[PDB]
Amino acid sequence: GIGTGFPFDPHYVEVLGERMHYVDVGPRDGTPVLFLHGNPTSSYVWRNIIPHVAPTHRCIAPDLIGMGKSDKPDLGYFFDDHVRFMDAFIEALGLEEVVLVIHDWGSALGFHWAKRNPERVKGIAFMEFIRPIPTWDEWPEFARETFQAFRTTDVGRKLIIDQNVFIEGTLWMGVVRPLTEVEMDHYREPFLNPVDREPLWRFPNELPIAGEPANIVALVEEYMDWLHQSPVPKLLFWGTPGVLIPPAEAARLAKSLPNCKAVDIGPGLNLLQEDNPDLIGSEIARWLSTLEI
Ligand SMILES: [Cl-]
């Protein structure tokens, strides 16, 4: 079935006095493809997509600061912290122009960086991405009560940090097919020390839902305005029923984003990579061949 192994040699780079881990495969010459995961995942989420792209393009997949095999300093892990570390990661590797492949909070990082560096982004492939959720009615019903509890300090931290609910419960609820024990262990590994679960709690508290927190809402609105104006080639993957991007929203985006190709992956929730990695990787690989790179 879907591959469970992580057959990538570790690479580390110094970023702002810490070290970040990243996958780095594929040819050295050309435009690199930068894969950005979100919550509560790591570069592991790209393990079955990267092999479709690596034959033709360099694939760089960092673990966000505090996650995967990256260092876990004593930060709050605000979106601003992820921005600072990812900006510095890209510069530390000397990347010039890139293609972005982005998901969940990795998509907020990717779109925010693209808005600020438009001349350096030659294409964006994205899925289940951060957009403003104007009211809780747009969040899926079965998951509203949980995310509302996550978005508190005392109850939410007890759930996410003390009891590891984002890993043990939410993650499994983000894939239609059942994650296997080996896959769960790969997702659990970075967070075996409860103190290291800080980013898993801060992330849902940063989600731009019903206008709060206002700083995140504004930043996400700004990159969405940029995206609808930009001629950058776009590739949107979507599934049914989705979580962040239900089918009706995917359809709205497909007709209103310039130069946008849209691919229905079939059944999918949030981690679309875990329900249909082969279609995602194969379509990205072919789409890269149509770009001016
Ligand atoms: Cl989240």
PDB file of C-alpha atoms and ligand atoms in Angstrom:
ATOM      1  CA  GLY A   1       0.000   0.000   0.000  1.00  0.00           C
ATOM      2  CA  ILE A   2       1.007   3.585   0.704  1.00  0.00           C
ATOM      3  CA  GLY A   3       4.643   3.706   1.777  1.00  0.00           C
ATOM      4  CA  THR A   4       5.433   4.094   5.467  1.00  0.00           C
ATOM      5  CA  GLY A   5       9.212   4.423   5.279  1.00  0.00           C
ATOM      6  CA  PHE A   6      11.253   7.627   5.441  1.00  0.00           C
ATOM      7  CA  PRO A   7      14.303   6.795   3.269  1.00  0.00           C
ATOM      8  CA  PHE A   8      15.938  10.225   3.265  1.00  0.00           C
ATOM      9  CA  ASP A   9      19.374  11.079   4.594  1.00  0.00           C
ATOM     10  CA  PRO A  10      19.316  13.823   7.249  1.00  0.00           C
ATOM     11  CA  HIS A  11      20.677  17.271   6.457  1.00  0.00           C
ATOM     12  CA  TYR A  12      21.060  20.069   8.964  1.00  0.00           C
ATOM     13  CA  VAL A  13      21.644  23.789   8.479  1.00  0.00           C
ATOM     14  CA  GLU A  14      22.301  26.505  11.060  1.00  0.00           C
ATOM     15  CA  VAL A  15      19.402  29.008  11.165  1.00  0.00           C
ATOM     16  CA  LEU A  16      19.289  31.864  13.712  1.00  0.00           C
ATOM     17  CA  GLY A  17      21.600  30.013  16.079  1.00  0.00           C
ATOM     18  CA  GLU A  18      19.565  26.786  15.945  1.00  0.00           C
ATOM     19  CA  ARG A  19      19.661  23.875  13.524  1.00  0.00           C
ATOM     20  CA  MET A  20      16.888  22.859  11.143  1.00  0.00           C
ATOM     21  CA  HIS A  21      16.594  19.415   9.588  1.00  0.00           C
ATOM     22  CA  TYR A  22      15.678  19.013   5.931  1.00  0.00           C
ATOM     23  CA  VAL A  23      15.363  16.449   3.163  1.00  0.00           C
ATOM     24  CA  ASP A  24      17.504  17.366   0.155  1.00  0.00           C
ATOM     25  CA  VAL A  25      17.335  15.031  -2.877  1.00  0.00           C
ATOM     26  CA  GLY A  26      17.364  15.350  -6.646  1.00  0.00           C
ATOM     27  CA  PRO A  27      19.656  17.104  -9.119  1.00  0.00           C
ATOM     28  CA  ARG A  28      21.723  20.078  -8.020  1.00  0.00           C
ATOM     29  CA  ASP A  29      21.160  22.248 -11.081  1.00  0.00           C
ATOM     30  CA  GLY A  30      17.889  23.990 -11.795  1.00  0.00           C
ATOM     31  CA  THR A  31      15.065  25.503  -9.856  1.00  0.00           C
ATOM     32  CA  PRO A  32      14.473  23.756  -6.515  1.00  0.00           C
ATOM     33  CA  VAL A  33      11.093  22.651  -5.201  1.00  0.00           C
ATOM     34  CA  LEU A  34      10.504  23.657  -1.580  1.00  0.00           C
ATOM     35  CA  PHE A  35       7.967  21.464   0.310  1.00  0.00           C
ATOM     36  CA  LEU A  36       6.422  23.013   3.449  1.00  0.00           C
ATOM     37  CA  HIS A  37       4.455  20.899   5.956  1.00  0.00           C
ATOM     38  CA  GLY A  38       2.098  22.127   8.661  1.00  0.00           C
ATOM     39  CA  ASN A  39       0.493  20.975  11.932  1.00  0.00           C
ATOM     40  CA  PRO A  40       1.161  18.366  13.450  1.00  0.00           C
ATOM     41  CA  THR A  41       3.318  16.881  10.703  1.00  0.00           C
ATOM     42  CA  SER A  42       6.909  17.081   9.416  1.00  0.00           C
ATOM     43  CA  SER A  43       8.763  16.342   6.185  1.00  0.00           C
ATOM     44  CA  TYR A  44       7.384  12.807   6.732  1.00  0.00           C
ATOM     45  CA  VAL A  45       4.109  14.026   5.178  1.00  0.00           C
ATOM     46  CA  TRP A  46       5.917  14.479   1.832  1.00  0.00           C
ATOM     47  CA  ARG A  47       7.705  11.089   1.849  1.00  0.00           C
ATOM     48  CA  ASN A  48       5.580   9.570  -0.954  1.00  0.00           C
ATOM     49  CA  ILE A  49       5.305  12.762  -3.027  1.00  0.00           C
ATOM     50  CA  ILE A  50       9.006  13.680  -3.183  1.00  0.00           C
ATOM     51  CA  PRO A  51       9.993  10.501  -5.113  1.00  0.00           C
ATOM     52  CA  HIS A  52       7.809  11.576  -8.047  1.00  0.00           C
ATOM     53  CA  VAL A  53       9.560  14.966  -8.255  1.00  0.00           C
ATOM     54  CA  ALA A  54      13.210  14.147  -7.404  1.00  0.00           C
ATOM     55  CA  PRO A  55      13.960  12.570 -10.826  1.00  0.00           C
ATOM     56  CA  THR A  56      13.728  16.021 -12.426  1.00  0.00           C
ATOM     57  CA  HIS A  57      14.075  18.586  -9.623  1.00  0.00           C
ATOM     58  CA  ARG A  58      15.884  19.225  -6.392  1.00  0.00           C
ATOM     59  CA  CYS A  59      13.475  18.582  -3.515  1.00  0.00           C
ATOM     60  CA  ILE A  60      14.020  20.464  -0.255  1.00  0.00           C
ATOM     61  CA  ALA A  61      11.657  19.610   2.613  1.00  0.00           C
ATOM     62  CA  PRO A  62      12.478  21.282   5.942  1.00  0.00           C
ATOM     63  CA  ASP A  63      11.046  20.385   9.295  1.00  0.00           C
ATOM     64  CA  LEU A  64       9.626  23.576  10.760  1.00  0.00           C
ATOM     65  CA  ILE A  65      11.389  24.891  13.837  1.00  0.00           C
ATOM     66  CA  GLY A  66      10.236  22.930  16.894  1.00  0.00           C
ATOM     67  CA  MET A  67       9.052  20.024  14.717  1.00  0.00           C
ATOM     68  CA  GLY A  68      10.346  16.845  13.104  1.00  0.00           C
ATOM     69  CA  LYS A  69      14.121  16.562  13.564  1.00  0.00           C
ATOM     70  CA  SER A  70      14.682  20.309  13.809  1.00  0.00           C
ATOM     71  CA  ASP A  71      15.835  21.826  17.073  1.00  0.00           C
ATOM     72  CA  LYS A  72      13.178  22.591  19.680  1.00  0.00           C
ATOM     73  CA  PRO A  73      14.145  25.839  21.423  1.00  0.00           C
ATOM     74  CA  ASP A  74      12.031  27.389  24.190  1.00  0.00           C
ATOM     75  CA  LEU A  75       9.873  29.560  21.929  1.00  0.00           C
ATOM     76  CA  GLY A  76       6.209  30.387  21.802  1.00  0.00           C
ATOM     77  CA  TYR A  77       6.061  29.047  18.222  1.00  0.00           C
ATOM     78  CA  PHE A  78       3.897  31.896  16.988  1.00  0.00           C
ATOM     79  CA  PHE A  79       3.369  32.103  13.259  1.00  0.00           C
ATOM     80  CA  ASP A  80       5.832  35.009  13.449  1.00  0.00           C
ATOM     81  CA  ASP A  81       8.458  32.619  14.798  1.00  0.00           C
ATOM     82  CA  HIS A  82       7.868  30.211  11.923  1.00  0.00           C
ATOM     83  CA  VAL A  83       8.177  33.113   9.475  1.00  0.00           C
ATOM     84  CA  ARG A  84      11.504  34.229  10.970  1.00  0.00           C
ATOM     85  CA  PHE A  85      13.013  30.738  10.909  1.00  0.00           C
ATOM     86  CA  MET A  86      11.734  29.842   7.440  1.00  0.00           C
ATOM     87  CA  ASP A  87      12.942  33.144   5.978  1.00  0.00           C
ATOM     88  CA  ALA A  88      16.359  32.413   7.440  1.00  0.00           C
ATOM     89  CA  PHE A  89      16.287  28.745   6.314  1.00  0.00           C
ATOM     90  CA  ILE A  90      15.704  29.788   2.691  1.00  0.00           C
ATOM     91  CA  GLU A  91      18.551  32.295   2.900  1.00  0.00           C
ATOM     92  CA  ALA A  92      20.860  29.824   4.666  1.00  0.00           C
ATOM     93  CA  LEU A  93      20.529  27.428   1.716  1.00  0.00           C
ATOM     94  CA  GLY A  94      21.151  30.267  -0.747  1.00  0.00           C
ATOM     95  CA  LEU A  95      17.930  29.673  -2.657  1.00  0.00           C
ATOM     96  CA  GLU A  96      17.140  32.220  -5.365  1.00  0.00           C
ATOM     97  CA  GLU A  97      14.040  31.276  -7.379  1.00  0.00           C
ATOM     98  CA  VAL A  98      11.916  28.357  -6.186  1.00  0.00           C
ATOM     99  CA  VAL A  99       8.726  26.424  -6.801  1.00  0.00           C
ATOM    100  CA  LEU A 100       6.612  26.016  -3.661  1.00  0.00           C
ATOM    101  CA  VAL A 101       4.639  22.903  -2.637  1.00  0.00           C
ATOM    102  CA  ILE A 102       2.730  23.835   0.493  1.00  0.00           C
ATOM    103  CA  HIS A 103       0.124  22.533   2.932  1.00  0.00           C
ATOM    104  CA  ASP A 104      -1.718  23.717   6.055  1.00  0.00           C
ATOM    105  CA  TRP A 105       0.527  26.080   8.062  1.00  0.00           C
ATOM    106  CA  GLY A 106       3.287  25.512   5.509  1.00  0.00           C
ATOM    107  CA  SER A 107       0.951  27.212   3.038  1.00  0.00           C
ATOM    108  CA  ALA A 108       0.666  30.326   5.198  1.00  0.00           C
ATOM    109  CA  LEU A 109       4.468  30.409   5.271  1.00  0.00           C
ATOM    110  CA  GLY A 110       4.721  29.823   1.519  1.00  0.00           C
ATOM    111  CA  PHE A 111       2.082  32.338   0.455  1.00  0.00           C
ATOM    112  CA  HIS A 112       3.402  34.970   2.896  1.00  0.00           C
ATOM    113  CA  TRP A 113       6.926  34.516   1.535  1.00  0.00           C
ATOM    114  CA  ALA A 114       5.676  34.628  -2.070  1.00  0.00           C
ATOM    115  CA  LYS A 115       3.795  37.889  -1.465  1.00  0.00           C
ATOM    116  CA  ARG A 116       7.023  39.421  -0.139  1.00  0.00           C
ATOM    117  CA  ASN A 117       9.247  37.799  -2.808  1.00  0.00           C
ATOM    118  CA  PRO A 118       7.059  37.488  -5.925  1.00  0.00           C
ATOM    119  CA  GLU A 119       9.921  37.570  -8.421  1.00  0.00           C
ATOM    120  CA  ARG A 120      11.419  34.481  -6.786  1.00  0.00           C
ATOM    121  CA  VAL A 121       8.337  32.217  -6.952  1.00  0.00           C
ATOM    122  CA  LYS A 122       7.960  30.414 -10.273  1.00  0.00           C
ATOM    123  CA  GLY A 123       4.948  28.300  -9.301  1.00  0.00           C
ATOM    124  CA  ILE A 124       2.873  27.266  -6.281  1.00  0.00           C
ATOM    125  CA  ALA A 125       1.265  23.858  -5.733  1.00  0.00           C
ATOM    126  CA  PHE A 126      -0.985  23.938  -2.683  1.00  0.00           C
ATOM    127  CA  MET A 127      -3.653  22.005  -0.845  1.00  0.00           C
ATOM    128  CA  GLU A 128      -5.712  22.269   2.359  1.00  0.00           C
ATOM    129  CA  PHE A 129      -4.238  25.700   2.939  1.00  0.00           C
ATOM    130  CA  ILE A 130      -4.727  28.509   5.477  1.00  0.00           C
ATOM    131  CA  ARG A 131      -7.496  30.892   4.412  1.00  0.00           C
ATOM    132  CA  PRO A 132      -9.705  33.087   6.606  1.00  0.00           C
ATOM    133  CA  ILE A 133     -12.550  31.055   8.124  1.00  0.00           C
ATOM    134  CA  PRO A 134     -15.112  33.848   8.587  1.00  0.00           C
ATOM    135  CA  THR A 135     -17.407  32.012  11.045  1.00  0.00           C
ATOM    136  CA  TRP A 136     -17.388  28.663  12.829  1.00  0.00           C
ATOM    137  CA  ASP A 137     -20.168  27.510  10.461  1.00  0.00           C
ATOM    138  CA  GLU A 138     -17.457  27.112   7.804  1.00  0.00           C
ATOM    139  CA  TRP A 139     -15.478  24.776  10.049  1.00  0.00           C
ATOM    140  CA  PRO A 140     -16.650  21.140   9.762  1.00  0.00           C
ATOM    141  CA  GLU A 141     -19.371  20.262  12.267  1.00  0.00           C
ATOM    142  CA  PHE A 142     -17.783  17.130  13.734  1.00  0.00           C
ATOM    143  CA  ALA A 143     -14.636  19.138  14.562  1.00  0.00           C
ATOM    144  CA  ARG A 144     -15.971  22.489  15.870  1.00  0.00           C
ATOM    145  CA  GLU A 145     -16.209  21.661  19.585  1.00  0.00           C
ATOM    146  CA  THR A 146     -12.693  20.190  19.613  1.00  0.00           C
ATOM    147  CA  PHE A 147     -11.019  23.120  17.856  1.00  0.00           C
ATOM    148  CA  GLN A 148     -12.904  25.578  20.052  1.00  0.00           C
ATOM    149  CA  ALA A 149     -11.533  23.781  23.113  1.00  0.00           C
ATOM    150  CA  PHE A 150      -8.038  23.748  21.563  1.00  0.00           C
ATOM    151  CA  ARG A 151      -8.313  27.549  21.310  1.00  0.00           C
ATOM    152  CA  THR A 152      -8.241  28.037  25.063  1.00  0.00           C
ATOM    153  CA  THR A 153      -5.290  28.145  27.411  1.00  0.00           C
ATOM    154  CA  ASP A 154      -6.211  25.816  30.226  1.00  0.00           C
ATOM    155  CA  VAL A 155      -8.430  23.251  28.478  1.00  0.00           C
ATOM    156  CA  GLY A 156      -6.558  23.461  25.158  1.00  0.00           C
ATOM    157  CA  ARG A 157      -3.086  23.006  26.641  1.00  0.00           C
ATOM    158  CA  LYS A 158      -4.261  20.073  28.747  1.00  0.00           C
ATOM    159  CA  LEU A 159      -5.654  18.446  25.597  1.00  0.00           C
ATOM    160  CA  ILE A 160      -2.779  19.170  23.214  1.00  0.00           C
ATOM    161  CA  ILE A 161       0.283  19.287  25.485  1.00  0.00           C
ATOM    162  CA  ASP A 162      -0.575  17.029  28.435  1.00  0.00           C
ATOM    163  CA  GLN A 163      -2.711  14.471  26.589  1.00  0.00           C
ATOM    164  CA  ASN A 164      -1.232  14.817  23.042  1.00  0.00           C
ATOM    165  CA  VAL A 165      -4.705  14.959  21.475  1.00  0.00           C
ATOM    166  CA  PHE A 166      -3.568  16.671  18.269  1.00  0.00           C
ATOM    167  CA  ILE A 167      -1.322  13.668  17.522  1.00  0.00           C
ATOM    168  CA  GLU A 168      -3.426  10.846  18.943  1.00  0.00           C
ATOM    169  CA  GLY A 169      -6.828  12.113  17.803  1.00  0.00           C
ATOM    170  CA  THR A 170      -6.884  15.093  15.441  1.00  0.00           C
ATOM    171  CA  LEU A 171      -4.178  13.736  13.120  1.00  0.00           C
ATOM    172  CA  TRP A 172      -6.037  10.456  12.564  1.00  0.00           C
ATOM    173  CA  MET A 173      -9.238  12.446  11.922  1.00  0.00           C
ATOM    174  CA  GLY A 174      -7.370  14.360   9.192  1.00  0.00           C
ATOM    175  CA  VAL A 175      -6.986  11.352   6.854  1.00  0.00           C
ATOM    176  CA  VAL A 176      -9.881   9.361   5.391  1.00  0.00           C
ATOM    177  CA  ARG A 177      -8.084   6.036   5.289  1.00  0.00           C
ATOM    178  CA  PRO A 178      -6.719   4.816   8.654  1.00  0.00           C
ATOM    179  CA  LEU A 179      -3.129   5.723   9.497  1.00  0.00           C
ATOM    180  CA  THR A 180      -1.090   2.670  10.437  1.00  0.00           C
ATOM    181  CA  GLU A 181       0.814   2.140  13.664  1.00  0.00           C
ATOM    182  CA  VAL A 182       4.159   2.677  11.893  1.00  0.00           C
ATOM    183  CA  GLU A 183       2.909   5.972  10.438  1.00  0.00           C
ATOM    184  CA  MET A 184       1.554   7.099  13.830  1.00  0.00           C
ATOM    185  CA  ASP A 185       4.953   6.342  15.383  1.00  0.00           C
ATOM    186  CA  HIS A 186       6.681   8.554  12.797  1.00  0.00           C
ATOM    187  CA  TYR A 187       4.259  11.385  13.603  1.00  0.00           C
ATOM    188  CA  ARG A 188       4.597  10.797  17.371  1.00  0.00           C
ATOM    189  CA  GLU A 189       8.400  10.713  17.421  1.00  0.00           C
ATOM    190  CA  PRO A 190       9.152  14.486  17.484  1.00  0.00           C
ATOM    191  CA  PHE A 191       6.799  14.989  20.433  1.00  0.00           C
ATOM    192  CA  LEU A 192       7.673  12.209  22.869  1.00  0.00           C
ATOM    193  CA  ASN A 193       8.730  14.945  25.311  1.00  0.00           C
ATOM    194  CA  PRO A 194       5.483  16.782  26.252  1.00  0.00           C
ATOM    195  CA  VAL A 195       7.260  20.131  26.623  1.00  0.00           C
ATOM    196  CA  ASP A 196       8.037  19.943  22.899  1.00  0.00           C
ATOM    197  CA  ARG A 197       4.315  19.995  21.996  1.00  0.00           C
ATOM    198  CA  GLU A 198       4.165  23.827  22.266  1.00  0.00           C
ATOM    199  CA  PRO A 199       3.841  24.344  18.453  1.00  0.00           C
ATOM    200  CA  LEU A 200       0.961  21.878  18.267  1.00  0.00           C
ATOM    201  CA  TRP A 201      -1.075  24.069  20.647  1.00  0.00           C
ATOM    202  CA  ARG A 202       0.015  27.456  19.342  1.00  0.00           C
ATOM    203  CA  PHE A 203      -0.924  26.579  15.741  1.00  0.00           C
ATOM    204  CA  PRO A 204      -4.695  26.075  16.266  1.00  0.00           C
ATOM    205  CA  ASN A 205      -4.652  29.238  18.385  1.00  0.00           C
ATOM    206  CA  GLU A 206      -3.212  31.105  15.347  1.00  0.00           C
ATOM    207  CA  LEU A 207      -5.901  29.845  12.952  1.00  0.00           C
ATOM    208  CA  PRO A 208      -7.750  32.860  11.441  1.00  0.00           C
ATOM    209  CA  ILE A 209     -11.284  31.900  12.512  1.00  0.00           C
ATOM    210  CA  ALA A 210     -14.112  34.391  13.088  1.00  0.00           C
ATOM    211  CA  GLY A 211     -11.683  37.317  12.900  1.00  0.00           C
ATOM    212  CA  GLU A 212      -9.334  36.153  15.673  1.00  0.00           C
ATOM    213  CA  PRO A 213      -6.488  36.434  16.139  1.00  0.00           C
ATOM    214  CA  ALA A 214      -6.688  39.701  14.223  1.00  0.00           C
ATOM    215  CA  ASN A 215      -2.977  39.870  13.321  1.00  0.00           C
ATOM    216  CA  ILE A 216      -3.146  36.484  11.580  1.00  0.00           C
ATOM    217  CA  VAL A 217      -6.435  37.296   9.817  1.00  0.00           C
ATOM    218  CA  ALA A 218      -4.882  40.444   8.340  1.00  0.00           C
ATOM    219  CA  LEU A 219      -1.722  38.671   7.138  1.00  0.00           C
ATOM    220  CA  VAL A 220      -3.701  35.842   5.532  1.00  0.00           C
ATOM    221  CA  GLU A 221      -6.103  38.292   3.852  1.00  0.00           C
ATOM    222  CA  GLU A 222      -3.090  40.135   2.442  1.00  0.00           C
ATOM    223  CA  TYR A 223      -1.584  37.030   0.872  1.00  0.00           C
ATOM    224  CA  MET A 224      -4.937  35.929  -0.526  1.00  0.00           C
ATOM    225  CA  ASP A 225      -5.367  39.338  -2.151  1.00  0.00           C
ATOM    226  CA  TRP A 226      -1.883  38.892  -3.614  1.00  0.00           C
ATOM    227  CA  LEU A 227      -2.664  35.381  -4.858  1.00  0.00           C
ATOM    228  CA  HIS A 228      -5.808  36.482  -6.733  1.00  0.00           C
ATOM    229  CA  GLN A 229      -3.772  39.242  -8.433  1.00  0.00           C
ATOM    230  CA  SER A 230      -0.687  37.191  -9.253  1.00  0.00           C
ATOM    231  CA  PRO A 231      -0.074  35.522 -12.640  1.00  0.00           C
ATOM    232  CA  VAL A 232       2.105  32.911 -10.900  1.00  0.00           C
ATOM    233  CA  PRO A 233       1.257  29.382 -12.143  1.00  0.00           C
ATOM    234  CA  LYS A 234      -0.922  27.624  -9.570  1.00  0.00           C
ATOM    235  CA  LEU A 235      -1.823  23.988  -8.927  1.00  0.00           C
ATOM    236  CA  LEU A 236      -4.591  23.309  -6.395  1.00  0.00           C
ATOM    237  CA  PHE A 237      -5.251  19.809  -5.043  1.00  0.00           C
ATOM    238  CA  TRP A 238      -8.537  19.223  -3.253  1.00  0.00           C
ATOM    239  CA  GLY A 239     -10.513  16.336  -1.808  1.00  0.00           C
ATOM    240  CA  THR A 240     -13.965  15.488  -0.481  1.00  0.00           C
ATOM    241  CA  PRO A 241     -15.064  16.566   2.103  1.00  0.00           C
ATOM    242  CA  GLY A 242     -11.884  18.451   2.963  1.00  0.00           C
ATOM    243  CA  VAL A 243     -11.313  20.361   6.199  1.00  0.00           C
ATOM    244  CA  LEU A 244      -9.856  23.800   5.445  1.00  0.00           C
ATOM    245  CA  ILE A 245     -10.965  23.709   1.778  1.00  0.00           C
ATOM    246  CA  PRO A 246     -14.360  22.038   1.170  1.00  0.00           C
ATOM    247  CA  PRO A 247     -15.235  21.267  -2.463  1.00  0.00           C
ATOM    248  CA  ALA A 248     -17.388  24.396  -2.874  1.00  0.00           C
ATOM    249  CA  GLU A 249     -14.397  26.519  -1.839  1.00  0.00           C
ATOM    250  CA  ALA A 250     -12.040  24.618  -4.149  1.00  0.00           C
ATOM    251  CA  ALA A 251     -14.471  25.322  -7.006  1.00  0.00           C
ATOM    252  CA  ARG A 252     -14.683  29.008  -6.059  1.00  0.00           C
ATOM    253  CA  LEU A 253     -10.862  29.270  -5.995  1.00  0.00           C
ATOM    254  CA  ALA A 254     -10.388  27.353  -9.258  1.00  0.00           C
ATOM    255  CA  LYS A 255     -12.437  29.855 -11.210  1.00  0.00           C
ATOM    256  CA  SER A 256     -11.113  32.991  -9.476  1.00  0.00           C
ATOM    257  CA  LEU A 257      -7.344  32.402  -9.225  1.00  0.00           C
ATOM    258  CA  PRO A 258      -5.291  33.297 -12.306  1.00  0.00           C
ATOM    259  CA  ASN A 259      -3.471  30.510 -14.110  1.00  0.00           C
ATOM    260  CA  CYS A 260      -4.823  27.842 -11.786  1.00  0.00           C
ATOM    261  CA  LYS A 261      -5.073  24.137 -12.526  1.00  0.00           C
ATOM    262  CA  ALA A 262      -7.170  22.121 -10.054  1.00  0.00           C
ATOM    263  CA  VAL A 263      -6.957  18.369  -9.364  1.00  0.00           C
ATOM    264  CA  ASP A 264      -9.600  16.341  -7.494  1.00  0.00           C
ATOM    265  CA  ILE A 265      -7.726  13.739  -5.432  1.00  0.00           C
ATOM    266  CA  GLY A 266     -10.856  11.861  -4.402  1.00  0.00           C
ATOM    267  CA  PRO A 267     -11.682  11.266  -0.745  1.00  0.00           C
ATOM    268  CA  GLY A 268      -9.647  13.503   1.507  1.00  0.00           C
ATOM    269  CA  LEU A 269      -9.737  15.508   4.727  1.00  0.00           C
ATOM    270  CA  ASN A 270      -6.689  17.635   5.666  1.00  0.00           C
ATOM    271  CA  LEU A 271      -3.579  15.513   4.972  1.00  0.00           C
ATOM    272  CA  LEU A 272      -4.420  14.913   1.314  1.00  0.00           C
ATOM    273  CA  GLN A 273      -0.878  13.506   0.896  1.00  0.00           C
ATOM    274  CA  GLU A 274      -1.909  10.531   3.041  1.00  0.00           C
ATOM    275  CA  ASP A 275      -5.009   9.636   0.995  1.00  0.00           C
ATOM    276  CA  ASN A 276      -3.623   9.973  -2.577  1.00  0.00           C
ATOM    277  CA  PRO A 277       0.124  10.661  -2.653  1.00  0.00           C
ATOM    278  CA  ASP A 278       0.727   9.144  -6.080  1.00  0.00           C
ATOM    279  CA  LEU A 279      -1.713  11.418  -7.902  1.00  0.00           C
ATOM    280  CA  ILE A 280      -0.322  14.456  -6.064  1.00  0.00           C
ATOM    281  CA  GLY A 281       3.299  13.635  -6.794  1.00  0.00           C
ATOM    282  CA  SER A 282       2.712  12.632 -10.401  1.00  0.00           C
ATOM    283  CA  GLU A 283       0.638  15.714 -11.190  1.00  0.00           C
ATOM    284  CA  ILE A 284       3.208  18.029  -9.563  1.00  0.00           C
ATOM    285  CA  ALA A 285       5.997  16.393 -11.575  1.00  0.00           C
ATOM    286  CA  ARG A 286       4.180  16.847 -14.889  1.00  0.00           C
ATOM    287  CA  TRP A 287       3.061  20.381 -14.002  1.00  0.00           C
ATOM    288  CA  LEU A 288       6.660  21.408 -13.243  1.00  0.00           C
ATOM    289  CA  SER A 289       7.561  20.453 -16.817  1.00  0.00           C
ATOM    290  CA  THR A 290       5.104  23.059 -18.124  1.00  0.00           C
ATOM    291  CA  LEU A 291       6.684  25.950 -16.155  1.00  0.00           C
ATOM    292  CA  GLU A 292       9.302  28.485 -17.290  1.00  0.00           C
ATOM    293  CA  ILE A 293      12.050  26.807 -15.261  1.00  0.00           C
TER     294      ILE A 293
HETATM  295 CL    CL B   1      -3.660  23.987  13.363  1.00  0.00          CL
END
